[PDB]
Amino acid sequence: NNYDGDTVTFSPTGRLFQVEYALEAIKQGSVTVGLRSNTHAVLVALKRNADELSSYQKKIIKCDEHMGLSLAGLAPDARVLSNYLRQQCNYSSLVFNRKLAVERAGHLLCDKAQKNTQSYGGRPYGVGLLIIGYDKSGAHLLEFQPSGNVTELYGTAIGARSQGAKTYLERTLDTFIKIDGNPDELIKAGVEAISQSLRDESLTVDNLSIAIVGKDTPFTIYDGEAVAKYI
Amino acid sequence: TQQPIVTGTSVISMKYDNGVIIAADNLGSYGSLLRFNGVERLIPVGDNTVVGISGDISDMQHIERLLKDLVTENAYDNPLADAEEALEPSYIFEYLATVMYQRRSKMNPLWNAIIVAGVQSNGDQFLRYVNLLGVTYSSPTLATGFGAHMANPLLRKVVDRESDIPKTTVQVAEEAIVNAMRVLYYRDARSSRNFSLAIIDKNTGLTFKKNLQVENMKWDFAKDIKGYGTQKI
Amino acid sequence: GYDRALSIFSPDGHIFQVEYALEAVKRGTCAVGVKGKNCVVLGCERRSTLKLQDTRITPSKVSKIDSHVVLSFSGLNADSRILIEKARVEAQSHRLTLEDPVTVEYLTRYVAGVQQRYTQSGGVRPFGVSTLIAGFDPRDDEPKLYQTEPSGIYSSWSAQTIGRNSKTVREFLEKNYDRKEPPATVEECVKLTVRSLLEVVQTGAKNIEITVVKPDSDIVALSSEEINQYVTQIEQEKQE
Amino acid sequence: TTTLAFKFQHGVIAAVDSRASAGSYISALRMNKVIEINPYLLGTMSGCAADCQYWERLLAKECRLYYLRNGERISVSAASKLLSNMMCQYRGMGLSMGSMICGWDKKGPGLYYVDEHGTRLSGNMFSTGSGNTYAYGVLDSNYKWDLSVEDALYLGKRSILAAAHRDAYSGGSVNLYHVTEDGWIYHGNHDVGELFWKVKEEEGSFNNVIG
Amino acid sequence: QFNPYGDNGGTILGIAGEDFAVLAGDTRNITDYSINSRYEPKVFDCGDNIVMSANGFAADGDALVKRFKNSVKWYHFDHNDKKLSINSAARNIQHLLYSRRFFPYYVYNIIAGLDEDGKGAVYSFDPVGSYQREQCRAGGAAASLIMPFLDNQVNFKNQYEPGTNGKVKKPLKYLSVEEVIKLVRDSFTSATERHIQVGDGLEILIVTKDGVRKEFYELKRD
Amino acid sequence: GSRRYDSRTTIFSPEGRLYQVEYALESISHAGTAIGIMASDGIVLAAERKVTSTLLEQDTSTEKLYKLNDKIAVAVAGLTADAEILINTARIHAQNYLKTYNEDIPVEILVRRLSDIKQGYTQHGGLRPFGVSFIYAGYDDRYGYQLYTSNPSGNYTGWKAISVGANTSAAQTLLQMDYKDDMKVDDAIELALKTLSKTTDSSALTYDRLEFATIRKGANDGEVYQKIFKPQEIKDILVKTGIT
Amino acid sequence: MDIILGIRVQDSVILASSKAVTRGISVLKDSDDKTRQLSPHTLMSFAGEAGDTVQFAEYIQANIQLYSIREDYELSPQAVSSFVRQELAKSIRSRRPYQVNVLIGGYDKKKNKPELYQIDYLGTKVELPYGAHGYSGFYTFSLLDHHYRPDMTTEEGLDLLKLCVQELEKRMPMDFKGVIVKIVDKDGIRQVDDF
Amino acid sequence: DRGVSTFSPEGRLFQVEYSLEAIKLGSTAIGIATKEGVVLGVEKRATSPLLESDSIEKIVEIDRHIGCAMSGLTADARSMIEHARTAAVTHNLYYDEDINVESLTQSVCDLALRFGELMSRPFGVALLIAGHDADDGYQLFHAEPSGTFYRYNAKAIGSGSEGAQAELLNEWHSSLTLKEAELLVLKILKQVMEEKLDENNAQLSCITKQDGFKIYDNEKTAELIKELKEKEAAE
Ligand SMILES: *[C@@](C)(CO)[C@](*)(O)[C@H](Cc1ccccc1)NC(=O)[C@H](Cc1ccc(OC)cc1)NC(=O)[C@@H](C)NC(=O)C1=CC2=CCC=CC2=C1C
Ligand SMILES: [Mg+2]
Ligand SMILES: [Mg+2]
């Protein structure tokens, strides 16, 4: 009300409204799902178009051979944060000959987003990210919020109507975690999960976007007729 | 640009079937003066890596601190710091190599020659060299300074190529290293009798031996040598 | 440094500071530009509220940017000096790096770019000035006349006016100026420029300034008596 | 190297050799010492090969940007000046670059000499490199404004040959160019080994040499 | 006074075929009169069917290769996983080298691969960035020993057809990969005999439309 | 943050005016009147000190008339402290010009420079403008005797006769009436004092409430002399013209 | 470059400047004009290190042309010479000084007098009736000391200048390829096409 | 007052949303992509008859293979065009090749959100970026001040955008020829424009693989306008 003019102002109940408004931009964004087993980690994203003449906005971005994310909210902010991850992943390789741990990648994103929430002049990031990766401690899935909060999960979903997919994964927890050495079945579970967030529209060939990473599988994105198999 | 003041001489090393060995004497020379006699030039990093350093001692102490700080920093927000995400020899080496090459590119080098010896997660042996120029290389045997000229020839008789590594035992490799250190004591004017030796094995882990001495030396034949040509008495 | 964003969008999609800069131009004295077949003429109003003025030393309304290009304006006088200085520096800078004098189009594009920069830079306000830039390109006999404004947009004009009561003199020019056959001579071009100002000026004494620019760096400013003869001839024909 | 370029009635000729040296060692037999900046602009190279390639390709970037901003091709005079100004920024920093900017613009054919000192000279005829003295000898005694395209191409070709023969750091092959108002025209790569024997027989020159 | 440069010896060799290319180099690393390693790889697969070797001062050579490999990675990120053509890679490397015009990478660089028409390509550089596409190039310590041999046996220089007596040249027939590898092995065997910095081992990287293949051959260790 | 407390000194009103410049001019209108009159053989500068005291040391006091160099002087109307900042800058600029070209600075060039500084404070920096209006009286070999004025907007204009400060409307009317082109310095002195005597808000115009100065070619042969009048000299010229 | 001469007569200033330009052992050009018009009645000739000369001259030219446009007024030769001196005096203590010597010939329209200023690369200014830079003065000043009068005509000034060039051509080892002569007077600047 | 980079309660940046309102006031620009090329057309909209219409430059060349049309505060586009031209030629310097249309568009869109308290406000102009490359063929992009860019088969921006976009919805198909696209742009421009469409107040352009980016002459466009009138009168 009087305490939402900038990011440097607490409300009387201890809330940061500019951060909460940035969080709102994520809810307006299109749905994206993340889930993993012990061997592989999968991203599934519902892409959004402007109209029938327009293309479908890309949702998934590659960060390294072993790491990448999906976005929901302001796309340009995701480009900034993914670029930062690309640099950090790359700094780890060039200096230490070491693939960046997914957990440490989350810590770096948290700290970058935090600086924007405590200083005058700037603004919080208006995007949520789901980071997947495979490192020395196996498969991983992270959820990033622009408040700074990063959380490691078995599965999750963000965006509009994301609660439906999140409930499904909460039921299926014991099943999909055990899908080891079977990428196609893990993707099936992700496609079935994101389907719980759909209304009116359904999954078409240029609508669906999938990405996967695993033990002997580099981070690769599937679009177009490559995802027709899973429709 | 500087000049080295207090210096440490040769560091020698080799691979064997289950790991690596590295050794270096305990002397800190001040030109021709054998000033400091209790200097440790082998510095362990965790229980899987030993960094051996020759050259300027003040720059060595600086590197020693960088490595100590590296271990501290790797443990930050890392539940697997004593397991999967522990520091590897390859990580430690590449860090140092990055530092050495950056410093030479600013014309303010760390006046050292470094050998990083260790065993990786998968049990593979690691042995790589780096120096003040940022020059790096790997070989079954590695040595700095005088050791390059006198020790390598002896160690290459045991492991002449890669295929000789599985055939070489730890007893044979340690014996060869100890003999090489004796030869250096005979012939290197900036060397000492006292030295340290480290073994990193993929089964038995890190064994760090201190206060070793060169023994079984041959001097008796000196009594018979008289004059510089014609003198008989 | 002072970084405050003064020029910003409003809910209806307007930048008020840029629009209020146009109001400063509306307040400024009237300036007019007319291009003939082989010349361009720049006319300027001088408000007669200020008498006891020393016309020798008072800053003239038309300014030479180079030997072949001139610039007149309407709006804040102090603001115009900054644009003129920058323009003059760029003109010499272009000769120094490219070995050719600026084209009229290039000089206009530079001045317009400066004006635009001051609409999306922190800690600064827009120039309260619109300019008429006229001249002839090197080794070219085709006349050039451009207009700029605070927002930074520019365009070429057969004839144009800016400043106070510019709506009236533009109305006059729109019906009197024929594109198929423009003022063939210097006389016809000046006469049309004086006629257009007489719709607004008040008295035709020291209130009208005229500057004729011809090809090959031939620029001259008319005197009071020379202009007064045009004023006399126009009204004598009007009495009929 | 030996490079030359001269203006004449039917435009401008540009001829260069193709040798590169690293001491007494011939590091390259066939190097390109002409750069096609645009279809009406050429640039010769003499000095540090790296400097010549980098700065003349950076000139082409800047000449291309000129066309986009102004909707018109850059003049030879302006192009040469941009290059001379680049040289003045790295004044005394150790660059080694001698070049001729050849082309056709509104003023007709244009030719400017530019070097690492920032020197910029307009003229009808220039020759740079370790063998320029040998080339000047042939050019000065045979040049006319009234030269035919066929005779002019041969002159530049024959002038490089003269230098390639005597100068130890010039040779390999001859690259010919002819600039017209429709643009430049490449007139081929000519091996000096073969060209020498051919010219010797047909012209009767190089009598001292046995073949 | 501190000398930031050094010489690690070695020699490299690039030859372009009709539909293939090779990039070879010895595996010996040296300082002065000592041997550092008998097997220290010098020619690398940089991705996108491109191979590269920077010969001279190993520290600068490793940094350049490392930087180019990085440039390839960022080219994929920035331009939708587009393949970096050999000509585009060459131009990119020129700018990496000239970034240090006043503190040079002390290396002679060579890359090899296939052009966009599927034909074999070799590009050669000097330490400060001048580059050019070539058919044949030897670089490094024994470059002056090998290049004349290649002029003779690859481009058939000074060779004429018998009976004509210097009137008709030997025609420029292309070489097969098997014939090229022979010239490479004989080049390095000869260089090993007469140059002290050359020896120990030989590693050849062959590039075809099918990918990058390796071949290793021993050399004299004296 | 800090934005909350920013007055925004460099913005346009909806009507296209600069708020702070207009309010600065309002400040200046309450300042003591200063008059400048240009004649064929010299220039006069006259100015009124504001409600003085008997205990003010007049002979060592200077609030209105300042010397920029040997050829140029200024009369001040507004905040004296603001004026001194600008005056010292102008003094430096004149010396920079003399050092560079080895010639005394032309009057207009000095005036333009000061006016450009004032302009800057209205367009950028977020600071308040200088609440000062100058009358420049000067001489050079190009245009001869010159009068200029500048105000907080940074706009400057040339004049034959002009007033700044209080009652300029009334003062300008009186000057416009009695001024003629063939006028001389001695006549201009009389006009300046008569105009102040009629426009003044004080009961009577006296020597202790005035500062006066002339720039004359009335110096031995082809050269110019600046005369800052002393208290006793102002008293004498008041008796001579028949005011006291 | 090599030789630049100057002489101030009754009603004009005459500047003579060599035409040669040399790189290495080769004379690249024999028609080079070592001068720039600073204003309609002010001409500056120059000589010094390669490249620096033209860059400096064009930089000065731009600054004076900028002044002329701003004030709609031509600076006096004295004012221009002082501006140039300061730029050179500023330059000599820079990281890399501009190694340029100049002569400034101008006609003062106010005083109706010709004026010649000699300024070296250090910023050493002197007003003279005749001047030169480098070794040129060693050969020519003896002739000028003998023959010069202040009431000389332009034609007499050219004849005395021819004698100076002939002496240079006889006793100098270097071939400077003749001179381009320019005259500065009340009517402006013109070139003597036959010399 | 309030921050320039402030979020609204709905989760949108106020200034970005307000700049979109400025773009709605701008003159109409239309783009249509086909397999034979991409066509770009604009409404000039001269404020007075004395204004020489040929000086209105709302269609612009970025490279030989990339063109651009604009709508909104057109003065803001000049720095964007300058950056685009620099980016296109710089990539040619570094990589000896043409730059991808998408990569060029991304470089322009990176400038968009570089505003705060960098420039003081977002751009008040939208761009239609049309071009061709070997990888993805003929392409049309819509670059906004939000930093977002969508690829389009056909797109209209400016004051008559929603009406024109609805018309483009029905008319566009994947087998359109270049000539058909030209007439289609002219048809829709004529529909949404206030004044009567002619060669002086409307401009056409196209980009083909062979000839590259070309702005159409007024004589060439005039014939296409006459060809349009006759085919509409044909039924
Ligand atoms: C004459 C041959 C003079 O020697 C020419 O001037 C020639 C000009 C030139 C050649 C190629 C491309 C453009 C222009 N210049 C040289 O060959 C030049 C001579 C030289 C050497 C050193 C300096 O430093 C003061 C200046 C000029 N040589 C080189 O630049 C040398 C360093 N180039 C190479 O050695 C070289 C090796 C090589 C391998 C593969 C591709 C390119 C290579 C080059 C340029
Ligand atoms: Mg040996
Ligand atoms: Mg001197």
Tab-separated table of C-alpha atoms and ligand atoms in Angstrom, chain G residues 118 120 124 133, ligand 3:
chain	number	residue	atom	x	y	z
G	118	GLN	CA	58.551	31.063	-36.213
G	120	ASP	CA	59.622	25.179	-32.955
G	124	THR	CA	59.588	28.632	-28.804
G	133	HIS	CA	63.649	25.638	-39.438
I	3	MG	MG	62.214	28.669	-32.947
